[PDB]
Amino acid sequence: LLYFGLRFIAANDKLWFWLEVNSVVDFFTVPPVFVSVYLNRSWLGLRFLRALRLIQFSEILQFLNILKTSNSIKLVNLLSIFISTWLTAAGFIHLVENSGDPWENFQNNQALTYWECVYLLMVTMSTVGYGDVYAKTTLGRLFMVFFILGGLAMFASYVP
Amino acid sequence: DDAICLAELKLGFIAQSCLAQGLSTMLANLFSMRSFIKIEEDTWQKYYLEGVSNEMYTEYLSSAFVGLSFPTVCELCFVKLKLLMIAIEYKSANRESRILINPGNHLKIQEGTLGFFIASDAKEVKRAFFYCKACHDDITDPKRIKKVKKYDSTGMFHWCAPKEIEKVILTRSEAAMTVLSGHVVVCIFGDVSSALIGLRNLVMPLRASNFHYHELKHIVFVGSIEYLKREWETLHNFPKVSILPGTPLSRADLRAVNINLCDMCVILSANQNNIDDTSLQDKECILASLNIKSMQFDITTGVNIPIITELVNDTNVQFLDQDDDDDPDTELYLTQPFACGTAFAVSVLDSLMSATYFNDNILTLIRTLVTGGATPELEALIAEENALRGGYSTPQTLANRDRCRVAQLALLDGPFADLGDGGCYGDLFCKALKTYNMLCFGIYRLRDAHLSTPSQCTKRYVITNPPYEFELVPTDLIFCLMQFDHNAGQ
Amino acid sequence: LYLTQPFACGTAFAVSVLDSLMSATYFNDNILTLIRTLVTGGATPELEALIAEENALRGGYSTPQTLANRDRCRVAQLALLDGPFADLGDGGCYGDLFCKALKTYNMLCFGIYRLRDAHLSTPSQCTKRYVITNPPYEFELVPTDLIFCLMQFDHNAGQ
Amino acid sequence: EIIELIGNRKKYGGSYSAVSGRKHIVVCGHITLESVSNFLKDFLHKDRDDVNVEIVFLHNISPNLELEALFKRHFTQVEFYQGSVLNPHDLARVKIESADACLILANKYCADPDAEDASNIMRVISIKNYHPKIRIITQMLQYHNKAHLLNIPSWNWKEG
Ligand SMILES: CC(C)CCC[C@@H](C)[C@H]1CC[C@H]2[C@@H]3CC=C4C[C@@H](OC(=O)CCC(=O)O)CC[C@]4(C)[C@H]3CC[C@]12C
Ligand SMILES: CC(C)CCC[C@@H](C)[C@H]1CC[C@H]2[C@@H]3CC=C4C[C@@H](OC(=O)CCC(=O)O)CC[C@]4(C)[C@H]3CC[C@]12C
Ligand SMILES: CC(C)CCC[C@@H](C)[C@H]1CC[C@H]2[C@@H]3CC=C4C[C@@H](OC(=O)CCC(=O)O)CC[C@]4(C)[C@H]3CC[C@]12C
Ligand SMILES: CC(C)CCC[C@@H](C)[C@H]1CC[C@H]2[C@@H]3CC=C4C[C@@H](OC(=O)CCC(=O)O)CC[C@]4(C)[C@H]3CC[C@]12C
Ligand SMILES: CC(C)CCC[C@@H](C)[C@H]1CC[C@H]2[C@@H]3CC=C4C[C@@H](OC(=O)CCC(=O)O)CC[C@]4(C)[C@H]3CC[C@]12C
Ligand SMILES: Nc1ccc(Oc2c(F)c(F)c(C(F)(F)F)c(F)c2F)c(O)c1
Ligand SMILES: [Ca+2]
Ligand SMILES: [Ca+2]
Ligand SMILES: [K+]
Ligand SMILES: [Mg+2]
């Protein structure tokens, strides 16, 4: 929270700082912790967004004057982006599948683990596609359809 | 079957601007189809956009104008129908167009005399055909009107015995003794193995036969002597032409010839197409133009020197002025240097294609107002000999001198000094026809005349065919078409 | 490049060392005229106005006001081996030499062009020298030293 | 093709925001890694008195990764904007009305000395056309081309 305050002050245009990915992940990550502490409860909500903080590594390493050459900068950028988005998608699938469908009164709950979801996303991105594990809820299928558009191209381009 | 030569028309427009500044930007605005634009804030655009709204059309004349003289018909058309009739074509065994006509000399032959008009659109021009005298006398409003060898072989240009090039070349010291005032200095950036612009089309209009000998303007070329001799073969028959080898970028050369006492200073380039870089094109023309503006004299500053320069890329027009408000989106016809007549790009002549199709006689009305009066018979002679053969004087040849010319008037003093402040343009127009038979068709007004705060800039812009009730300030110039006077004091 | 021996001895020169003049002229207004006056042998406004018109030079006739422009300090070198300054060659007080020259001859000393191996006990025959810019007041001198100077023009001459 | 067509955007578009009580300068011309590094190393040296002028670059080629890293290292005192100095919109974007000076760098190791001089002359003409009272510092490669700058209407050598 304090680090977010310092970034807010140093910004030039507050509107376009507010509409930023790091600000958004802070907004969707920080307040629920205080809410849970007040309510004496908890909920595995949009916690998977914590993997989106891995993007700032390539910039803070340049701030620390560690990365100076183009090849290393490009390699770190590619690795960070790939790993971060992979883990975020896996977390979203985990939440949606383990929770259920709100309009179905939570009766489609399929028991999955985070490692199994990571395996599922890897198999989907690789375009191999076994039938051992797959999404079975409506929200999971919808997100899988929308992720197939982008993740496949990202995997085809970044890994080589 | 019309061929539109771009170089000939461009050089003719420039040469016509030499006689009267702003004429090129007035004529190039008569062939672009534009609608009326009204703005509220009081700037010079407010009057310039009203001026540019006009175009030039043509249509036949009603039977009400059969037995009447051209000045009377023109005055009637103006006052009643709010139309400006500039010229007519005289139907005969072969067609012939008269620019402006003195009374008695030509009565309307009634044989479907085709008149040329300047108006907002063809709908207003249609009034002239439907005009019924008995019916429409009462209707005041324009609306509701409904049903030694001295001359050329053809005797149209001045001529002289051929002179070799070495007899006209000057030097920097030599040019100092010669006193030149009201001349024309031409700056050319050409060189060997470069595209050959036709310099005959520039000086030939300036040597028309309707000018008296003493009224001719001296012409001085400033450029590479190697390039000039490549086309001196077509120039050595004209009187009062000189050459000063050097470079127009040299401030020393521009002082040898009295550049602060001139009428125009034309700037041209010949190798503009060879350059592949978009930005580096027009480097010479823009830099040479700015050089003159920064020079100092003991008229005390180079800003007031009248200059015209051609451009190959019209987006560079922003660099020609300092006090302008440059914008890379406004069209060339609206920027300040074009509105003032100090710039000319060939892209403004693209509109002449469509204008020729709808009425073929336009291309022959222009090209005689612009060119000195070249006839197809003369063009045959140049095709074979390419030397502009001269001839003797006969009464038929001396009768071709009598044709109107383009001149610029001044309201400061003279017969029209009284109307300088009263402010009725219609009164000046009506008086001009009935007294001296000159046709006024525009105002060349100071850029900062409307502002209350006094200023020092002397830039002006063109207002084409102002309304009848237009107001006149004493500090402005009038465009006119003046009759040739056979006798005149020297 | 600024540490190499050929550059430190004045036997080499590259244009890449002049890139610092961009920031030097921004902070101080009149440096560019000081350099051009010191280097090009005259950058007066009279030359600037004239060079804009003709882009060349013209001969003239000498006049008493014209011949008054021939009073400009020039760059020159001096040797302590022989002359009025020979006494200070072995002495070794740079400040004393500076004051004496300025008071007497109006000569400004602003450097030492010292022999390279003058600080070594062992003898040598190398004749390479390097530049020392603005040494402190308490600087030791040796007889084999050359001092940069600015000397006034003298109207009379032996000729 | 859709993925490529979307996301084709300029990340360095924008406009400079003036700060009350602080000067700034505009640098344009031959912008490259070595030139920028040398210029910054000489401009921000500690031997100079305390200075707080900002440096605003303006080039029409997007910087590469290591130049971006350099700008990140000089984060709080250097800014970059993409544009052309021959464009009045860009000149107004970089707030050249209140700039204290404009510096033009040259390409010493160029193939043709004359074309570089012509380009610099065009840049100077454009800047003086937009604002005829700004101070300009430029580098010229050939002496006979320097005389052309003496004929610009607003070029005052008596002023700086
Ligand atoms: C990205 C941001 C804007 C969050 C967007 C979330 C919405 C898309 C979700 C969150 C809560 C959802 C609601 C949660 C519960 C219900 C009740 C549900 O009706 C029931 O009572 C369930 C059992 C039954 O159908 O009888 C109908 C769907 C609805 C409105 C859901 C519709 C979709 C909502 C609005
Ligand atoms: C915009 C992104 C971030 C989220 C998109 C979420 C949608 C896919 C959700 C939000 C609201 C949902 C609807 C909310 C409630 C219903 C009613 C539900 O039917 C009933 O509740 C009773 C009738 C039946 O059993 O079908 C059927 C699904 C449906 C249309 C849901 C379908 C899925 C919807 C459109
Ligand atoms: C993409 C590359 C970097 C590999 C990613 C590996 C992850 C899929 C691993 C790393 C850490 C693992 C977690 C580490 C510890 C636990 C707790 C573990 O449970 C307990 O220890 C408590 C008892 C229970 O609930 O079973 C269950 C598995 C889980 C969530 C693991 C799930 C799989 C994770 C997230
Ligand atoms: C070097 C990086 C990639 C980390 C390597 C270690 C992880 C990939 C390991 C550490 C703990 C492992 C977990 C330990 C136990 C389980 C429970 C297991 O579920 C069972 O109860 C057994 C199911 C079966 O045996 O089929 C599923 C795999 C999982 C999540 C494992 C997945 C792989 C994990 C996360
Ligand atoms: C891209 C945006 C507009 C979302 C598109 C989908 C949604 C508009 C929702 C609205 C109602 C939903 C439907 C509501 C009910 C069903 C029946 C359902 O039939 C089953 O056997 C249930 C399986 C399960 O959901 O567990 C399959 C999904 C489907 C077609 C849903 C698919 C997703 C739909 C079309
Ligand atoms: N335990 C639980 C409770 C409610 C849930 O409803 C959500 C939902 F319907 C939805 F569409 C989104 C979306 F905006 F991300 F898409 C969510 F985030 C949701 F949380 C859920 O998924 C799980
Ligand atoms: Ca119109
Ligand atoms: Ca301008
Ligand atoms: K498959
Ligand atoms: Mg800043």
Side-chain angles (χ1 to χ4, degrees), chain B residues 249 251 279-280 283 287 290-291 294 318-319 321-322 324 326-328, chain D residues 86-89 118-119 121-122 125-126 128-129 148 150-154:
Chain B
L249 289 171
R251 196 174 303 198
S279 172
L280 294 174
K283 184 188 82 84
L287 201 54
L290 289 162
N291 180 17
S294 84
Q318 47 187 12
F319 298 144
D321 277 340
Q322 307 290 92
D324 50 9
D326 305 301
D327 188 307
Chain D
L86 283 72
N87 195 318
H89 291 337
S119 309
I121 289 185
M122 295 296 172
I125 289 184
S126 167
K128 285 286 190 171
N129 174 31
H148 291 348
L150 270 294
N151 302 354
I152 309 298
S154 313

mmCIF file of all heavy atoms in Angstrom, chain B residues 249 251 279-280 283 287 290-291 294 318-319 321-322 324 326-328, chain D residues 86-89 118-119 121-122 125-126 128-129 148 150-154:
data_model
loop_
_atom_site.group_PDB
_atom_site.id
_atom_site.type_symbol
_atom_site.label_atom_id
_atom_site.label_comp_id
_atom_site.label_asym_id
_atom_site.label_seq_id
_atom_site.Cartn_x
_atom_site.Cartn_y
_atom_site.Cartn_z
ATOM 1 N N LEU B 249 22.214 33.303 -54.372
ATOM 2 C CA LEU B 249 22.440 33.227 -52.935
ATOM 3 C C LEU B 249 23.481 34.225 -52.449
ATOM 4 O O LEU B 249 23.558 34.480 -51.243
ATOM 5 C CB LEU B 249 22.869 31.812 -52.544
ATOM 6 C CG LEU B 249 21.796 30.729 -52.629
ATOM 7 C CD1 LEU B 249 22.411 29.357 -52.434
ATOM 8 C CD2 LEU B 249 20.713 30.980 -51.597
ATOM 9 N N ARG B 251 24.799 37.614 -51.528
ATOM 10 C CA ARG B 251 24.252 38.929 -51.217
ATOM 11 C C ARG B 251 24.981 40.048 -51.950
ATOM 12 O O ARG B 251 24.430 41.145 -52.088
ATOM 13 C CB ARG B 251 24.304 39.163 -49.705
ATOM 14 C CG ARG B 251 23.437 40.310 -49.219
ATOM 15 C CD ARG B 251 23.420 40.393 -47.702
ATOM 16 N NE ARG B 251 22.957 39.152 -47.090
ATOM 17 C CZ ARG B 251 22.521 39.058 -45.837
ATOM 18 N NH1 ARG B 251 22.485 40.133 -45.064
ATOM 19 N NH2 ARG B 251 22.119 37.889 -45.360
ATOM 20 N N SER B 279 12.278 16.291 -48.285
ATOM 21 C CA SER B 279 12.608 17.483 -47.511
ATOM 22 C C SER B 279 13.606 18.369 -48.246
ATOM 23 O O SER B 279 13.455 19.596 -48.278
ATOM 24 C CB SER B 279 13.152 17.082 -46.140
ATOM 25 O OG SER B 279 13.644 18.212 -45.440
ATOM 26 N N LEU B 280 14.635 17.768 -48.844
ATOM 27 C CA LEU B 280 15.705 18.549 -49.449
ATOM 28 C C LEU B 280 15.302 19.205 -50.762
ATOM 29 O O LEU B 280 16.060 20.035 -51.274
ATOM 30 C CB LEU B 280 16.942 17.678 -49.664
ATOM 31 C CG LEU B 280 17.583 17.196 -48.364
ATOM 32 C CD1 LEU B 280 18.724 16.226 -48.639
ATOM 33 C CD2 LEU B 280 18.048 18.374 -47.526
ATOM 34 N N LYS B 283 15.237 23.394 -51.407
ATOM 35 C CA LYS B 283 16.238 23.960 -50.509
ATOM 36 C C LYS B 283 16.760 25.286 -51.040
ATOM 37 O O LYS B 283 16.933 26.241 -50.277
ATOM 38 C CB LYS B 283 17.395 22.977 -50.319
ATOM 39 C CG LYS B 283 18.454 23.441 -49.319
ATOM 40 C CD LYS B 283 19.666 22.525 -49.321
ATOM 41 C CE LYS B 283 20.622 22.874 -50.448
ATOM 42 N NZ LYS B 283 21.541 23.985 -50.065
ATOM 43 N N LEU B 287 15.756 28.986 -49.269
ATOM 44 C CA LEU B 287 16.897 29.688 -48.691
ATOM 45 C C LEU B 287 17.162 31.006 -49.407
ATOM 46 O O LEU B 287 17.502 32.007 -48.767
ATOM 47 C CB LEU B 287 18.134 28.795 -48.727
ATOM 48 C CG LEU B 287 19.251 29.155 -47.748
ATOM 49 C CD1 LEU B 287 18.714 29.242 -46.334
ATOM 50 C CD2 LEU B 287 20.376 28.137 -47.832
ATOM 51 N N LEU B 290 14.525 33.594 -48.263
ATOM 52 C CA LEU B 290 14.788 34.124 -46.929
ATOM 53 C C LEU B 290 15.985 35.064 -46.923
ATOM 54 O O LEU B 290 16.060 35.965 -46.082
ATOM 55 C CB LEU B 290 15.010 32.980 -45.943
ATOM 56 C CG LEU B 290 13.774 32.155 -45.582
ATOM 57 C CD1 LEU B 290 14.177 30.822 -44.980
ATOM 58 C CD2 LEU B 290 12.882 32.925 -44.628
ATOM 59 N N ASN B 291 16.928 34.868 -47.846
ATOM 60 C CA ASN B 291 18.097 35.737 -47.912
ATOM 61 C C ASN B 291 17.696 37.175 -48.219
ATOM 62 O O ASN B 291 18.221 38.115 -47.614
ATOM 63 C CB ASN B 291 19.071 35.210 -48.966
ATOM 64 C CG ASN B 291 20.316 36.064 -49.098
ATOM 65 O OD1 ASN B 291 20.632 36.872 -48.226
ATOM 66 N ND2 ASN B 291 21.031 35.890 -50.202
ATOM 67 N N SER B 294 16.190 39.255 -45.275
ATOM 68 C CA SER B 294 17.086 39.660 -44.201
ATOM 69 C C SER B 294 18.067 40.749 -44.612
ATOM 70 O O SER B 294 18.826 41.226 -43.763
ATOM 71 C CB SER B 294 17.859 38.445 -43.683
ATOM 72 O OG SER B 294 19.006 38.198 -44.475
ATOM 73 N N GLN B 318 4.830 26.643 -45.774
ATOM 74 C CA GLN B 318 4.837 27.178 -44.418
ATOM 75 C C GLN B 318 6.124 27.916 -44.085
ATOM 76 O O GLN B 318 6.122 28.760 -43.185
ATOM 77 C CB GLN B 318 4.621 26.048 -43.411
ATOM 78 C CG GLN B 318 5.474 24.824 -43.672
ATOM 79 C CD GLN B 318 5.121 23.665 -42.768
ATOM 80 O OE1 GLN B 318 4.093 23.681 -42.093
ATOM 81 N NE2 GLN B 318 5.976 22.650 -42.747
ATOM 82 N N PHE B 319 7.217 27.626 -44.784
ATOM 83 C CA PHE B 319 8.519 28.193 -44.461
ATOM 84 C C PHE B 319 8.761 29.553 -45.099
ATOM 85 O O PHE B 319 9.818 30.147 -44.865
ATOM 86 C CB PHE B 319 9.629 27.227 -44.884
ATOM 87 C CG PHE B 319 9.583 25.908 -44.174
ATOM 88 C CD1 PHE B 319 9.928 24.740 -44.829
ATOM 89 C CD2 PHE B 319 9.189 25.836 -42.851
ATOM 90 C CE1 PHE B 319 9.884 23.525 -44.176
ATOM 91 C CE2 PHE B 319 9.144 24.624 -42.193
ATOM 92 C CZ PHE B 319 9.491 23.468 -42.856
ATOM 93 N N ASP B 321 7.071 32.417 -44.638
ATOM 94 C CA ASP B 321 6.728 33.566 -43.813
ATOM 95 C C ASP B 321 6.990 33.247 -42.350
ATOM 96 O O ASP B 321 6.932 32.089 -41.929
ATOM 97 C CB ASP B 321 5.266 33.984 -44.000
ATOM 98 C CG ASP B 321 5.063 34.859 -45.217
ATOM 99 O OD1 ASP B 321 6.051 35.450 -45.696
ATOM 100 O OD2 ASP B 321 3.914 34.961 -45.693
ATOM 101 N N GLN B 322 7.273 34.295 -41.577
ATOM 102 C CA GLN B 322 7.563 34.170 -40.155
ATOM 103 C C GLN B 322 6.357 34.448 -39.269
ATOM 104 O O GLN B 322 6.154 33.747 -38.274
ATOM 105 C CB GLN B 322 8.700 35.119 -39.763
ATOM 106 C CG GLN B 322 9.949 34.978 -40.609
ATOM 107 C CD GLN B 322 10.677 33.680 -40.345
ATOM 108 O OE1 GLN B 322 10.438 32.674 -41.012
ATOM 109 N NE2 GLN B 322 11.573 33.693 -39.364
ATOM 110 N N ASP B 324 3.183 34.135 -40.013
ATOM 111 C CA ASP B 324 2.025 33.301 -40.288
ATOM 112 C C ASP B 324 1.812 32.289 -39.165
ATOM 113 O O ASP B 324 2.692 32.041 -38.336
ATOM 114 C CB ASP B 324 2.186 32.573 -41.622
ATOM 115 C CG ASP B 324 3.517 31.853 -41.738
ATOM 116 O OD1 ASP B 324 4.239 31.765 -40.725
ATOM 117 O OD2 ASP B 324 3.834 31.360 -42.840
ATOM 118 N N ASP B 326 1.371 28.675 -39.112
ATOM 119 C CA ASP B 326 1.487 27.478 -39.934
ATOM 120 C C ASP B 326 0.638 26.344 -39.378
ATOM 121 O O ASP B 326 0.499 26.184 -38.163
ATOM 122 C CB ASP B 326 2.948 27.040 -40.026
ATOM 123 C CG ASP B 326 3.857 28.144 -40.524
ATOM 124 O OD1 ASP B 326 3.634 28.642 -41.648
ATOM 125 O OD2 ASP B 326 4.799 28.514 -39.793
ATOM 126 N N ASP B 327 0.065 25.550 -40.285
ATOM 127 C CA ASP B 327 -0.729 24.388 -39.940
ATOM 128 C C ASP B 327 -0.568 23.415 -41.099
ATOM 129 O O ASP B 327 -0.789 23.808 -42.255
ATOM 130 C CB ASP B 327 -2.205 24.727 -39.727
ATOM 131 C CG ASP B 327 -3.004 23.558 -39.174
ATOM 132 O OD1 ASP B 327 -2.963 22.456 -39.761
ATOM 133 O OD2 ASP B 327 -3.678 23.745 -38.141
ATOM 134 N N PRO B 328 -0.195 22.162 -40.837
ATOM 135 C CA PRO B 328 0.028 21.202 -41.922
ATOM 136 C C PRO B 328 -1.236 20.570 -42.482
ATOM 137 O O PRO B 328 -1.135 19.572 -43.201
ATOM 138 C CB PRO B 328 0.912 20.144 -41.248
ATOM 139 C CG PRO B 328 0.469 20.155 -39.832
ATOM 140 C CD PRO B 328 0.094 21.581 -39.514
ATOM 141 N N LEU D 86 10.268 18.902 -37.959
ATOM 142 C CA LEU D 86 9.662 19.617 -39.072
ATOM 143 C C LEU D 86 8.140 19.626 -38.998
ATOM 144 O O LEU D 86 7.480 19.849 -40.019
ATOM 145 C CB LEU D 86 10.109 19.018 -40.408
ATOM 146 C CG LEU D 86 11.502 19.339 -40.961
ATOM 147 C CD1 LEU D 86 12.599 18.654 -40.172
ATOM 148 C CD2 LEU D 86 11.590 18.963 -42.429
ATOM 149 N N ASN D 87 7.569 19.390 -37.818
ATOM 150 C CA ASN D 87 6.123 19.318 -37.648
ATOM 151 C C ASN D 87 5.709 20.316 -36.577
ATOM 152 O O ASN D 87 6.147 20.191 -35.411
ATOM 153 C CB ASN D 87 5.689 17.898 -37.277
ATOM 154 C CG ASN D 87 4.199 17.678 -37.441
ATOM 155 O OD1 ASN D 87 3.388 18.532 -37.087
ATOM 156 N ND2 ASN D 87 3.831 16.522 -37.976
ATOM 157 N N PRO D 88 4.890 21.317 -36.909
ATOM 158 C CA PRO D 88 4.441 22.266 -35.881
ATOM 159 C C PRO D 88 3.683 21.606 -34.746
ATOM 160 O O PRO D 88 3.778 22.066 -33.602
ATOM 161 C CB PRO D 88 3.551 23.235 -36.671
ATOM 162 C CG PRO D 88 4.026 23.117 -38.081
ATOM 163 C CD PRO D 88 4.397 21.678 -38.247
ATOM 164 N N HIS D 89 2.939 20.534 -35.025
ATOM 165 C CA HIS D 89 2.245 19.831 -33.952
ATOM 166 C C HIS D 89 3.228 19.254 -32.945
ATOM 167 O O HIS D 89 3.033 19.385 -31.734
ATOM 168 C CB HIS D 89 1.359 18.729 -34.529
ATOM 169 C CG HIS D 89 0.182 19.243 -35.298
ATOM 170 N ND1 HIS D 89 -0.336 20.506 -35.106
ATOM 171 C CD2 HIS D 89 -0.577 18.666 -36.259
ATOM 172 C CE1 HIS D 89 -1.364 20.684 -35.915
ATOM 173 N NE2 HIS D 89 -1.532 19.583 -36.626
ATOM 174 N N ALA D 118 22.583 20.356 -44.918
ATOM 175 C CA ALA D 118 21.287 20.777 -45.441
ATOM 176 C C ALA D 118 20.155 20.395 -44.494
ATOM 177 O O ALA D 118 19.234 21.187 -44.261
ATOM 178 C CB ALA D 118 21.065 20.171 -46.825
ATOM 179 N N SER D 119 20.208 19.182 -43.940
ATOM 180 C CA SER D 119 19.184 18.762 -42.988
ATOM 181 C C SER D 119 19.197 19.637 -41.742
ATOM 182 O O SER D 119 18.139 20.027 -41.233
ATOM 183 C CB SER D 119 19.385 17.294 -42.617
ATOM 184 O OG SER D 119 19.509 16.492 -43.776
ATOM 185 N N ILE D 121 20.203 22.723 -41.584
ATOM 186 C CA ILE D 121 19.673 24.024 -41.981
ATOM 187 C C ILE D 121 18.151 23.988 -42.014
ATOM 188 O O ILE D 121 17.482 24.924 -41.562
ATOM 189 C CB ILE D 121 20.260 24.450 -43.339
ATOM 190 C CG1 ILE D 121 21.734 24.824 -43.191
ATOM 191 C CG2 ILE D 121 19.481 25.616 -43.920
ATOM 192 C CD1 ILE D 121 22.351 25.362 -44.460
ATOM 193 N N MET D 122 17.582 22.907 -42.550
ATOM 194 C CA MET D 122 16.130 22.763 -42.548
ATOM 195 C C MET D 122 15.573 22.750 -41.134
ATOM 196 O O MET D 122 14.550 23.388 -40.854
ATOM 197 C CB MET D 122 15.727 21.485 -43.276
ATOM 198 C CG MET D 122 16.054 21.496 -44.741
ATOM 199 S SD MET D 122 15.089 22.799 -45.516
ATOM 200 C CE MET D 122 15.771 22.812 -47.159
ATOM 201 N N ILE D 125 15.670 26.240 -39.713
ATOM 202 C CA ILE D 125 14.642 27.063 -40.343
ATOM 203 C C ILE D 125 13.274 26.745 -39.762
ATOM 204 O O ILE D 125 12.484 27.649 -39.478
ATOM 205 C CB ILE D 125 14.666 26.875 -41.871
ATOM 206 C CG1 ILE D 125 15.910 27.527 -42.470
ATOM 207 C CG2 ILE D 125 13.414 27.450 -42.502
ATOM 208 C CD1 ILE D 125 15.953 27.476 -43.977
ATOM 209 N N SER D 126 12.974 25.460 -39.573
ATOM 210 C CA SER D 126 11.676 25.076 -39.025
ATOM 211 C C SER D 126 11.496 25.601 -37.606
ATOM 212 O O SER D 126 10.437 26.141 -37.257
ATOM 213 C CB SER D 126 11.528 23.557 -39.057
ATOM 214 O OG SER D 126 10.422 23.143 -38.276
ATOM 215 N N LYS D 128 13.035 28.147 -36.077
ATOM 216 C CA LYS D 128 12.905 29.601 -36.061
ATOM 217 C C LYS D 128 11.594 30.058 -36.685
ATOM 218 O O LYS D 128 11.063 31.106 -36.303
ATOM 219 C CB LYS D 128 14.087 30.248 -36.778
ATOM 220 C CG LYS D 128 15.376 30.224 -35.982
ATOM 221 C CD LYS D 128 15.328 31.244 -34.858
ATOM 222 C CE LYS D 128 16.685 31.418 -34.206
ATOM 223 N NZ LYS D 128 16.699 32.569 -33.266
ATOM 224 N N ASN D 129 11.062 29.299 -37.643
ATOM 225 C CA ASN D 129 9.759 29.623 -38.205
ATOM 226 C C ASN D 129 8.667 29.473 -37.161
ATOM 227 O O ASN D 129 7.777 30.324 -37.056
ATOM 228 C CB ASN D 129 9.473 28.729 -39.410
ATOM 229 C CG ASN D 129 8.074 28.910 -39.951
ATOM 230 O OD1 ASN D 129 7.501 29.995 -39.873
ATOM 231 N ND2 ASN D 129 7.508 27.841 -40.494
ATOM 232 N N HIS D 148 25.367 30.162 -44.630
ATOM 233 C CA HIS D 148 23.936 30.165 -44.911
ATOM 234 C C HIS D 148 23.120 30.516 -43.674
ATOM 235 O O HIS D 148 22.079 31.172 -43.788
ATOM 236 C CB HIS D 148 23.509 28.808 -45.464
ATOM 237 C CG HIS D 148 24.046 28.521 -46.831
ATOM 238 N ND1 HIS D 148 24.642 29.487 -47.612
ATOM 239 C CD2 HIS D 148 24.082 27.378 -47.555
ATOM 240 C CE1 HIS D 148 25.020 28.951 -48.759
ATOM 241 N NE2 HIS D 148 24.691 27.672 -48.750
ATOM 242 N N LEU D 150 23.846 32.661 -41.551
ATOM 243 C CA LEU D 150 23.896 34.105 -41.359
ATOM 244 C C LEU D 150 22.801 34.838 -42.121
ATOM 245 O O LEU D 150 22.613 36.037 -41.895
ATOM 246 C CB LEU D 150 25.264 34.646 -41.778
ATOM 247 C CG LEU D 150 26.365 34.722 -40.716
ATOM 248 C CD1 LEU D 150 26.002 35.742 -39.650
ATOM 249 C CD2 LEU D 150 26.645 33.365 -40.085
ATOM 250 N N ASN D 151 22.077 34.155 -43.005
ATOM 251 C CA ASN D 151 21.046 34.782 -43.816
ATOM 252 C C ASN D 151 19.635 34.468 -43.338
ATOM 253 O O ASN D 151 18.673 34.978 -43.918
ATOM 254 C CB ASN D 151 21.204 34.360 -45.278
ATOM 255 C CG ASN D 151 22.566 34.718 -45.838
ATOM 256 O OD1 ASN D 151 23.366 35.379 -45.175
ATOM 257 N ND2 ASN D 151 22.836 34.285 -47.063
ATOM 258 N N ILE D 152 19.489 33.639 -42.308
ATOM 259 C CA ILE D 152 18.157 33.415 -41.737
ATOM 260 C C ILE D 152 17.654 34.721 -41.135
ATOM 261 O O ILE D 152 18.434 35.435 -40.474
ATOM 262 C CB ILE D 152 18.198 32.298 -40.683
ATOM 263 C CG1 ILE D 152 18.881 31.057 -41.257
ATOM 264 C CG2 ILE D 152 16.801 31.952 -40.202
ATOM 265 C CD1 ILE D 152 18.161 30.467 -42.439
ATOM 266 N N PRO D 153 16.389 35.097 -41.343
ATOM 267 C CA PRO D 153 15.928 36.405 -40.845
ATOM 268 C C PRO D 153 16.051 36.585 -39.341
ATOM 269 O O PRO D 153 16.341 37.696 -38.882
ATOM 270 C CB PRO D 153 14.463 36.441 -41.296
ATOM 271 C CG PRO D 153 14.430 35.585 -42.505
ATOM 272 C CD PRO D 153 15.414 34.479 -42.255
ATOM 273 N N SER D 154 15.842 35.531 -38.556
ATOM 274 C CA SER D 154 15.788 35.651 -37.106
ATOM 275 C C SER D 154 17.052 35.161 -36.413
ATOM 276 O O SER D 154 17.080 35.089 -35.182
ATOM 277 C CB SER D 154 14.574 34.896 -36.563
ATOM 278 O OG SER D 154 13.410 35.206 -37.308
#
